[PDB]
Amino acid sequence: EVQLVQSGAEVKKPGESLKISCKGSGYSFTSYWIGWVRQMPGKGLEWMGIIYPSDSDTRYSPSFQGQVTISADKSISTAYLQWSSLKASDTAMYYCARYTNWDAFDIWGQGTMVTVSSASTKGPSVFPLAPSSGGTAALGCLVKDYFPEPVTVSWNSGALTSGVHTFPAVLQSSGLYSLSSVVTVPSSSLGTQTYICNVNHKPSNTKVDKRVEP
Amino acid sequence: EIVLTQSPATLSLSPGERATLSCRASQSVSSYLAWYQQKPGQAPRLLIYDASNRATGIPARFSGSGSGTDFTLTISSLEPEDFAVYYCQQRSNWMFPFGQGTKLEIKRTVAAPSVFIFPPSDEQLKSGTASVVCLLNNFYPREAKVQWKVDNALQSGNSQESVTEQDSKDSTYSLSSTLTLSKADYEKHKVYACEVTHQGLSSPVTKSFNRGEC
């Protein structure tokens, strides 16, 4: 099977150096160009550069020239992408892809997520979105100021799943993430039913169960 | 130096329907044009190479055509796995521009959002920050304008939105808009209002509260 396998997710601070890898398998790595493509959160694909592993002939896009270094070790079928000084704007998914004489990227790596932020690891602060016409009420938890991703949220230990929406996290200007998880319930159940959001943040070993009362 | 313009930005159709996607190059070049598909949460993959050839393992329902500067991708009858983002790419000497992408999304009937507003919690206020959350639940199409008004004055630069991906069961979107203020600015004002404009509502709908009321 022809494949490109990339190195794991990285979490860094601005100024730090970083080198990520792309390992080819099931084919003669030396014989095909390898391209690097960036995908910023919520954005499209941008070509960064390309390298021919045989002689390390490298070409960069003008937007990336002098900002990153693309290199390859053909002896171990591996291409690399490196930064000497990461920027917060380098936060993106990075893909490596095999280029062919059909002028196309026929095989792609699975992607390497790179998150760059001045923030250090930090558990979230969890606040209620308290329920206050109609037979439906909305309630939730605001999971604020944590880093890095991800957090998981369940309601009543997984017993409440219908009507739950947990929003994608948004990176705030502070470099910390925030999201809300909400649920719509019958307004008549507010006096009777207990609602608890279970929030887990594995990078900080934080777990919070927040009771949301009207 | 060429630009690839994809249209439409969002193509809304149902499984069983025929899809036609467009890619127009600003200049005509001799390199081969390719189409890529990126399913939610996955790496891109090659679909079509040299404008009309299906890549390995790509089903017969995908076809491509065009020449000069006008290219088209067609899916004869959509399957649920085809709802994804599609990008075109064509090399310009040593530069490799991609189109901005077309999102192929599930069309369903128009559904107005249910709108809820949540004041900041007293626990958050004690920490010096106030987050006011506005929830737009289960609406279609995705396009929605959310405007914050504090004492009937329009706000700008102090809010962030997050939108869910299209629900796998009912094909609607949900959206959160969070207004962030310092505790001192929050307590200087009285009326907090979230105004929603959406195709499913005959007029914009506002949800509001007067600070410090039960």
Residue numbers in the entry:
A (entry chain H): 1 to 132, 137 to 218
B (entry chain L): 1 to 214
Quote the paper.
Using a small, focused library, we engineered AAL160, an anti-IL-1β antibody, to bind the unrelated antigen IL-17A, with the introduction of seven mutations. The final redesigned antibody, 11.003, retains favorable biophysical properties, binds IL-17A with sub-nanomolar affinity, inhibits IL-17A binding to its cognate receptor and is functional in a cell-based assay. The structures of the 11.003/IL-17A and the AAL160/IL-1β complexes highlight the contribution of germline residues to the paratopes of both the template and re-designed antibody.
AAL160 is a well-characterized antibody with good physicochemical attributes. The AAL160 template might represent a middle ground between mature and germline antibody: on one hand it is functional and specific, but on the other hand, some of its CDRs are almost identical to the germline sequence. Notably, both predictions are based on the original sequence and structure of AAL160 that does not bind IL-17A at all, without taking into account mutations that will enable binding to IL-17A.
